[PDB]
Symmetry: D2
């Protein structure tokens, strides 16, 4: 609404003794439109280079609006669909052309789907958008000459491989590191917030999925500029884990490696870790060595990037999420505020106009028998009129959001699959890290009561 | 709240052409306290009869309040626990003695659990309460002399077998059929409601898990009394499926059997079914033969009794649920209405009293440095006072609910696991079938908008 | 070899008190070539009738040799492949055109596959052959105009549905019942064998997946003719279960129904079953009521028709299998007996010719250094000659078996996936039921010792 | 038998361009009796130290014969059992006291088990024996005072944790490194064999799960002594991977780290790996960088140590296994050679003595009717006599093997679960690595034909 930190589960900032931050996308903000466009290009490129896809793909035009965050795709049928909170298909596309409610139903023999079925891709990653947009064009081309390109599920895997390789390959980090200004966006409020929480005995640490050599470059560029004379960015973090292999870092058991800030060389760890630079590791050992409880640790990330059930049951420490798209969602809803009120009132006028439609319709066969024959036919059109207006209003309201997929947190009336992932995974969430740091490091974040249908409100 | 039908998903009663009713517990109401007590006795009996459990169990006193609906038990550790909407253990018991947050955490190595792990029993059945209460006493005895009784998971299976046998055995149906007055509770409103929906071209049908011979006895006793001269209860239902094997009836493919209302004898079906009595069957064939769409069929039951995912994805027709316990929940909340307001106001007084605690606490080290040393120590006690009151108030509020497990739909602040099952499984739910029939058979049930944390309310 | 009953696990016929027989294909033999051709036609027909597949399929010519028993198909890629004992792909086909070792490897990223992956169909049914042959042609047509036909996995499901419907539909049973002479093959030895085992206190019972009305027709035609005056076929069986729903009949819990031999009408069972006609049921209750142990019951079937693990762990009574194709396998091996000896000797001649190739090859660099340069080049061709002969011989040996898939029990040198299913599922197996009855009903079937590689033979 | 290398699947040593060796237990032999005893002690110790188990365990006497390789234990019931090739329980123990066939059957409701059920531990590790022996004593103590020790499955996990910690802790490696003579056993034949294969263009590499610092110590001690002047052990290996994290090393994607042989420090890899010391890694990248095919790589290990299906389907390169216990198995069978012949002949004498028992038994009711009443009663005792002898002989034969669990590769008549794991996982296997190196590095290992029951032998 009009706040900065949205709460899902209670969390006392006074009890938190350490805060973990995902360097990329959480601690260091990026230009979503550019970063995505870059990955899309690199991947679109590598495909026709190491997989020899048809050259036509080289001429694929990227459109950022072609996809929205939180979409799910099934590599089997080469489809992309917006799922509801319970897996119900709100709207689907095969490639780029929408699928009729009819064809969808006949295809999935149900309005629901089974995310347990690995044939679907429901993981929240920082490259979903690009992936979705590309995969869409990549299936259209496939439908044309299906003999030249692999199968729908094959393409999906290939794209995933490229997206993956380009990330560990070095291709991506290089293009950006040599353009820190087109891709990364800075803000002093972040360095100020960190300093604020530090002044409260709170120890900050970061865990990235990038090499130290590269991390030292981004951090320096994105932080140093805002420090005072004599200060160093490395004095902001008590710990910094590089090539953390984030997903598994939380629930796995991969070993740590002490990193020499100077050379960059490393040596195996033979005891409890201590303030400094490390590589790899796992949350279990980290929490242990620091002599604290998981509930005394809060980690903030940009994308779930994994299975919520295992992440929450196997890790044990508090988790928050920063959702960038939240900026546009809130903005669009505020913009549609007036249109919302209009459908609302138009609705009430249709509700009582219908409430009376039955009152005199039941009476027509509950006490009498044929008397209002023309009476009902009067409200029957008087309702088809107001309902026609509501149709148009709902249409205007759509113009305020992504025309192809509507809003991110909504799957029609109910919340979207992504809205559910956030609710389950993050106890707290906001548009950008800065919002959280803006508050008092000793704030007690409470949640608003849900209130069930059978509950009485006061 | 102050309504009869609670809505979870939109459903237009004008589009529904057929309504299915679960005979036992939905169409025919029972005395939960008695019916449960009976099953508990029969099962407690059969155990020491076919399994030779220690005679001590014969002296087990049944207490209806020892369990609440929607609990989950893990046969492995012989524990019973109240799970939240996302599997977090709100409170657990090993046998009958509560488990400390500490011991729970060390036992489950997490505050969450994996319902996918078959070692847990999370199915909503009409015998859960009794089962829970018995299983509890059955583990206490086990802990005493663990050499005489099977393992925790063994006991669980045994109990399930007895509960099952006693149901198909005939033991249960007989005790009740010979006491239709101690166990079953009647109400003319039901027969009136049925007649009402029938007068609107709506075809009602029922599917029970009992033999016809027995069904004809309950129906006659529970319905006939309220009909007019010349009327027969069999004229209320277009179809009646006996020994439907409910769970699988919806998603399986078991074949139908035409039943002769007179003899009770049967013959295989060799074509589309037609109005009358049948046995077994499956929803797929039933929907087909009637030439209608699944969405044009509404089935109302008393307990989910199965896996929600498969039931909803594999069946396809609308489903509502009647939750009896809802009567006491609403009643208790209304009773605690005044106490609720008190913690509420006591909270606001603690909120701003804390809001100012930081305002002058941060200032103590944000602009100054040691000046309000005694100032803060004044509000620190003034807050420990109001918080102490809130503690007592929350205590009084508990007295209004089941002392051992709190409310059914709540797992602390958030909804309970059962509240989630209802939300996902039923588009509509109410305390008793009668509530639904009280409305207009051409009612359009709409749901209230959820509203997310980041949503702005008008 | 030269025996009738092949043993996999020890079984004492003196301990067996009851023998169960699968009516179709086990007790009553059929003309595999015709029965398959019929199903193929019916299914090929229904598709273009209820699914509207392209009319071209109506002109599909059936070839019985296009498939062999025990093949596996993956509905995903529309492929059919012959798996080894451990899931290694011995040879694969996409539609009808073989796949190169190279393309196979790149497609499955391994020479093995995961039968746990439901995308594969590895169930041994009595319609696999036809299904395979049709599915092959059904994918070829698909590749031509992929826009008109469903997806590879869709087609597979459709075919399965038709194969299924045509079986419960009545279409199949009717064509045959009106041609018992073109489809069914009789033999008095069966009626004599039954009478023989009966004379030894052994109770025979049958469980079919067909209606009684139809069973009474086949049994009468296939048995009565061989009885003596005053005898009746119904006097051969102590029990006869109809519409047994075989697969689940063994491990499920479906209830029994007493069947009136005259009318055909039925009534629910309210106690232990007794000699006579029943419908449905489950092995658990059957074994119980008869007061015997599972190990005292032997069931003989024609196809595994299910999951071996569950069938063997959840059922508990002895199981044998009758494999019709065994007739041609043995026949072909005997026919290739002489060719086998030739590759064998040609092998020994290549073995020692190679044994000496290294002896003088290692010596060329183990004690000396370049001396037999031309010496080795002499045996190098003398080996490429004998190896060329062996190549041709192996070629001649193939002509003795199915040219497209080789033998049923072999996947190259090692046994085939099907050979493994038989080994695990049946303790005893033979070409036809008659073979078993030919032996003494009090025979003790022993198995030959396996003998491991590191074992010393005497 | 009388050979050194036992073959399961064909493998041409001429095609193999690289051979991987597991350093511990494969390349460097150990004193199984001592190494196990050590682990048992360390683990028995750590338990009462970090888990505070009852001090009584400190007095537990280790017995090496209490367990045999290839056993399976189910943490749930705290049982240890010897499974057959298909999961059938040949013999089980709850703690230390055997379980009757009767109690076993009632406990597992079947003679089979489901290894897919994670409640079982079926992984072949180098610490199974010790683990089994300890776990047994650890459940006996539990049964005494079940209130002091965790649950059966808890204990199992604890033991696994200690076994694991003690391995990564350093506790184990230290005790041994300071006693390389009590634990490790050397043999020059190994260094000679390596040199032999190297002289044939074959590149050897090793991958251990230990740190380099420690590896350099064992290798030097176990190899250097056998080299010629000027030679170094590091000249025997083209590659050496340390802390390979073996299990996942084959199918995972963990990254490599170049290791500085001198300092021991490391640096991330930014290109194809090259001859030298590395840490971590994965088979996929390794095979790629070397520009060879998986089938051109052979890895020899001491224990499967993982899931065979994933290891074989996800890795792709050839695998052999060295089974130490094979030394005693072969030895014992040779020792029982004469006793074997005796039961064999005693069997034949019982076979024909039974063959004639039926011949004159059937005749007693196949042509006559009561005539040999006393005749049969003569052979009935003459058979109970020879069968009594066979009973004693089988008894003498057992004395030649582990009295508690019989042989490792046998589960009664058929092969054991472990025999199956070897057959499926290793294409080749032998008692010790040395055996393989004794052969010509350009040997073509062929397998003996299996031969099915219905096969005719020449």
């Amino acid at each position: 609404d009009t706040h900065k930190v949205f709460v899902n589960r209670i969390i006392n900032m006074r009890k938190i003794k350490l805060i973990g931050l995902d360097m990329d996308h959480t601690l260091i903000r990026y230009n979503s439109k550019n970063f995505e466009s870059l990955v899309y290009d690199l991947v679109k490129e590598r495909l026709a280079e190491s997989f020899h896809y048809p050259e036509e793909i080289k001429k694929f035009k990227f459109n950022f609006d072609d996809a929205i965050r939180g979409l799910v795709i099934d590599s089997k049928n080469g489809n992309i669909l917006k799922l509801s909170r319970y897996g119900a298909i709100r709207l689907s596309y095969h490639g780029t052309k929408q699928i009729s409610f009819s064809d969808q139903k006949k295809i999935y023999r149900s309005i629901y789907v089974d995310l347990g079925d690995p044939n679907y891709m429901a993981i929240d990653t920082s490259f979903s958008i690009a992936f979705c947009i590309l995969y869409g064009q990549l299936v259209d081309l496939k439908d044309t000459n299906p003999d030249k390109m692999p199968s729908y599920q094959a393409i999906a895997q290939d794209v995933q491989y490229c997206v993956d390789k380009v990330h560990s390959d070095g291709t991506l980090k290089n293009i950006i590191i040599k353009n820190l200004k087109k891709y990364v966006i800075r803000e002093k409020e972040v360095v100020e917030g960190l300093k604020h929480f530090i002044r409260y005995g709170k120890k900050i640490f970061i865990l990235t999925n990038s090499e130290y050599s590269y991390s030292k470059l981004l951090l320096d560029y994105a932080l140093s500029p805002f420090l005072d004379k004599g200060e160093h960015w490395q004095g902001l973090f008590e710990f910094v884990i590089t090539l953390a292999n984030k997903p598994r870092f939380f629930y796995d058991n991969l070993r740590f490696l002490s990193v020499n800030p100077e050379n960059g060389t490393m040596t195996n760890v033979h005891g409890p870790i201590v303030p400094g630079v490390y590589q790899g590791g796992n949350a279990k050992k980290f929490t242990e060595d620091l002599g604290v409880g998981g509930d005394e640790i809060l980690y903030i990330g940009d994308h779930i990037y994994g299975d919520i059930l295992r992440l929450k049951k196997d890790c044990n420490w508090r988790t928050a999420l920063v959702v960038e798209e939240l900026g546009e969602e809130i903005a669009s809803q505020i913009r549609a505020l007036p249109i919302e009120k209009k459908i609302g009132e138009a609705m009430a006028i249709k509700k009582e106009l219908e409430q009376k439609y039955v009152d005199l319709c039941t009476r027509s066969i509950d006490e009498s028998s044929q008397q209002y024959d023309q009476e009902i036919h009067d409200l029957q059109l008087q309702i088809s009129t107001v309902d026609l207006q509501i149709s148009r209003l709902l249409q205007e309201q759509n113009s305020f959001y992504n025309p192809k997929w509507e809003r991110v947190f909504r799957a029609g009336a109910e919340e979207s699959y992504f809205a559910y992932q956030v609710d389950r995974f993050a106890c707290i969430y906001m548009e950008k890290l800065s919002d959280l740091l803006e508050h008092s490091p000793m704030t007690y974040f409470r949640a608003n009561r849900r209130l069930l249908a059978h509950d009485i409100d006061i």
